């Protein structure tokens, strides 16, 4: 599933990300490579159990492919931002100003079995303010592709 969405651009973003964590340039990221990438980003308080927890997710040396497979496997239902924006633009169909909370609450719960009312309240809390104001779909897309603080 993890090689089927997954475009060349996404994969290059990942390749560059790997080479930035890959301190030694060897081709395999290890505990040492993780330690000074954390240090270069300002994080000095790193304990071995956290570094080890990271590495334990893979069965072998963390090599480009083992990385790409492990990160794909967690994003099995995740698109690139423009594609996600298309789904909202279809729900927008009139254009420019994004949708209201009620209109999508109902459409996530209704056709099919469930986007559950536990999942949806977590959605209004983790998607915001945004979801209250303009149900800011533009913002929603940027936070899922680019991190939570941004």
32 annotated ligand binder: no
- Asked if residue 2 is part of any domain, the answer here is no
Q: Other C-beta atoms within 10 Å of 95: how many?
A: 7
**DSSP characters over 18-42:** HHHH-TT-SS---HHHHHHHHHHTT
26 in a known ligand binding site: yes
Number of domains in the chain: 2
Q: How far apart are CA 93 and CA 98, in angstroms?
A: 10
To one decimal, the resolution in angstroms is: 35.0
Q: Tell me the C-alpha distance between 103 and 81, whole Å.
A: 22
Question: Is residue 47, in this structure, part of any structural domain at all?
Answer: yes
Same domain? For 17 and 69 the reply is: yes
> What domain range includes position 69?
8-74
Residues 29 and 63 in one domain: yes
Around Cβ 141, how many Cβ atoms within 10 Å?
A: 20
Residues 89 and 49 in one domain: no
Q: Are residues 67 and 89 in the same domain?
A: no
The technique is cryo-EM
33 is in an annotated binding site: yes
User: Quick one: 67 and 90 in the same domain?
Assistant: no
Q: b vs e for 116-132, b when ≥16 Cβ sit within 10 Å of the residue's Cβ?
A: eeeebeebeeebeebbe
Q: At what angle do helices 81-91 and 137-146 cross, to 10 degrees?
A: 160
* Coil vs helix vs strand at 46: coil
């Amino acid at each position: 599933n993890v090689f089927s969405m997954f475009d060349q651009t996404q994969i290059q973003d990942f390749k560059e990300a790997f080479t930035v964590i890959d301190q030694n340039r060897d081709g395999i990221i290890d505990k040492d490579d993780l330690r000074e990438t954390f240090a270069a980003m300002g994080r000095l308080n790193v304990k071995n159990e956290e570094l080890d927890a990271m590495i334990k997710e893979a069965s072998g040396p963390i090599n480009f492919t083992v990385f790409l497979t492990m990160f794909g496997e967690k994003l099995k239902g995740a698109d690139p931002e423009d594609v996600i924006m298309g789904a909202f633009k279809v729900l927008d169909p009139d254009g420019k100003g994004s949708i209201k909370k009620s209109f999508l609450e109902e459409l996530l719960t209704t056709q099919c079995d469930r986007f559950t009312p536990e999942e949806i309240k977590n959605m209004w809390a983790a998607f915001p303010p945004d979801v209250a104001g303009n149900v800011d779909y533009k913002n929603i897309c940027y936070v899922i592709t680019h991190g939570e603080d941004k």
